[PDB]
């Protein structure tokens, strides 16, 4: 076979950044084989909206986008079409007509430390809801109050970013879950991606 898609790069990256700054990786000009995806760890949630699970290999697309991030157990449901929640509206929004499969698996072994995995962050304060497929990384002190914050923290002035803490003893639903969202798009060009 000429080419195989870098599925072992989007998965097994050993660091998925955070949901507020999600990795946007472009997959193109390769043969997409989902056999290795199935051969990876058992998936807590493997739901396909636009592309049928059976026809994943059959259908061909011009470009493939995979978004990798780490979210809590209960936040997995918010990553879906038509679902509203803190993560969905302020971190990452799947479009209304999203086509692809949401792939999630448990990462308590790697992403949890007894000291605490404060590195991962999420956003819980923002002025307006995010449009689909948008990235925001700039930290402006949230001005919920009537007075300008002047770029410092204090009364009615909170930093939008907040940290997940991941520990081995956490229960399922708060354990860190690794989610890589496969986005398939058709463009006015040769597909060059066939399974």
């Amino acid at each position: 076979i000429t080419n195989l898609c870098p599925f072992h790069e989007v998965f097994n990256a050993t660091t998925f950044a955070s949901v507020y700054a999600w990795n946007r990786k472009r997959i193109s000009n390769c043969v997409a084989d989902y056999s290795v995806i199935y051969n990876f760890a058992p998936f807590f949630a493997f739901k396909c909206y636009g592309v049928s699970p059976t026809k994943l290999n059959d259908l061909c697309f011009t470009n493939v986008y995979a978004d990798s991030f780490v979210i809590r157990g209960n936040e997995v449901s918010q990553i879906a079409p038509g679902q509203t929640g803190n993560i969905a509206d302020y971190n990452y929004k799947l479009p209304d007509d999203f086509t692809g499969c949401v792939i999630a698996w448990n990462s308590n072994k790697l992403d949890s430390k007894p000291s605490g995995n404060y590195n991962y962050l999420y956003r819980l304060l923002r002025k307006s809801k995010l449009k689909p497929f948008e990235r925001d990384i700039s930290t402006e002190i949230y001005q919920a109050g009537n007075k300008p914050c002047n770029g410092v923290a204090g009364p009615n002035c909170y930093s939008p970013l907040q940290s997940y803490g991941f520990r081995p003893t956490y229960g399922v639903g708060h354990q860190p879950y690794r989610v890589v969202v496969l986005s398939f798009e058709l463009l006015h060009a040769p597909a060059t991606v066939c399974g």
């Binding site: 819980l124 304060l125 919920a144 009364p155 909170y158 907040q162 803490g165 520990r167 399922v172 639903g173």
Partner: protein, 596 residues
Amino acid sequence: STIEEQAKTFLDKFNHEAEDLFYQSSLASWNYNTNITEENVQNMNNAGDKWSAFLKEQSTLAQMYPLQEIQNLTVKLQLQALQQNGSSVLSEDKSKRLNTILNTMSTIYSTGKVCNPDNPQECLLLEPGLNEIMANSLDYNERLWAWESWRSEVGKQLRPLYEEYVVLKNEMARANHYEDYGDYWRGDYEVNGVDGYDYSRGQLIEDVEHTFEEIKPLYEHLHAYVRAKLMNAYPSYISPIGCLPAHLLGDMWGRFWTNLYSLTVPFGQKPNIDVTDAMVDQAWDAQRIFKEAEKFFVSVGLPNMTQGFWENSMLTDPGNVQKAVCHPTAWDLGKGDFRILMCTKVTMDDFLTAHHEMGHIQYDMAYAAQPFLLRNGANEGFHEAVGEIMSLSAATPKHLKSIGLLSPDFQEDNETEINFLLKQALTIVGTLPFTYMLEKWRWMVFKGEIPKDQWMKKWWEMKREIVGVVEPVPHDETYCDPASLFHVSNDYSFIRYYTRTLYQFQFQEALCQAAKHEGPLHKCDISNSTEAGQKLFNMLRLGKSEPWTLALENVVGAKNMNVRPLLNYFEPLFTWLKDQNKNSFVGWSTDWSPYA
């Protein structure tokens, strides 16, 4: 924007930080309790100080928002909880001396030692030896000596300390909006803003008084029976018309009459139901004891335990090198972690206690979704009430036979039911007059109705009138009789036990109607009824979000506590007591006393 949205964002930030900090503190405390060592103590102290500082800072911050502008019937309660001023409003010297008084009272209660009369060989602490002597020894003189010596040992020492304590706590309450410290304690039962479900702080006084007025006949008949039995046991000391002497009640303070089951047993021939030998023959261990307890909650429709719970929880005594505390406790550490710290052995009491603790954890799991501040029971009583209903249902002979510990051959007679009901009566009904009396005395002292020069006189007069207990050796104002009790010494509210005692039987009546039981309430098992489980889960999920009045309405169909379920529970014993008390005087006379 509006302050309501500002308060909402503040609450979100506070919740998300407080969850992590509380988890750190809870994990430190769990580590200390499971494995006692200097490093663990240091970590727990650090975590506790950090959490206390964070709570103080957030409480100071939250005072910006006036509660008048908050409408959401949830943000208002969270902001009220934060604005309760855990930050000591008192002056620095006043706070330091209040902490000193609390520490001194705790130290005196814990290190109070009683020495033998004119014998310096041993000076006994209260808990290890003196309590056992009071519980099991049948010597009138020894019991009287133990009681009087403990009173003179602790109450005389703590009387000026208790006076300074009441003065300082009254000053703290006056600084706050509450009328007195009794009002501060009753504020937990208060409900404001929800018309048609509201409650008043003073309304608790009327409800408790009316409930005791309803209870009084049963307590009088049980008192007559116990008086007759204790007269048979001790011939000269007990009078027929007089009240019972204090030291013969069964414990140091008379709180519990469980020690009197041997002396007041209805039928000696009939053996009590106990499954220790059966469990040993079937070769059980603590893990499967807890599994059998879990199957009950699975049957009632509630969820089952977490794999993390099974992995982290220590249900078996480590023994040997490991050092740990063996007081049972159910821990909701936070963020989905639930554990039990229990040195469980193969005994029926341990099995029932395991049921009680897993009831605690089911409550904690149910209210997990709600915000951190509201992640508690609706009032102080519901949490142990939910534990106790499961404990009661677990011990039923129907449940025992369904599990298979009890043989199919056995059937229960009148005598077994009477014995079981009378044992649970001495456990449950007896403590209600004592709790009522202690809370009435303490509330009156806080309000100032009882003068300092008449503290103990009014205390013993009200005990003689209400609890029907007479002091063996007369005590002047130097003694401080209430100071001996643990809750009085360490400043714990005591009306929680009365409320729990009523609530558990209201819950049991409601869930037995849900399970469609026919017959006496005592032989009621809610195991396989999924209606009762759902009816309970309705309240369990609410937490503190809805008022406790609404939670109680949801479960039992009433907005107020009623003792009718308790009287329906003990009706068979009430009839048996009528029958046995035909030749015994009912009621007690105050005038008689052991002295003069």
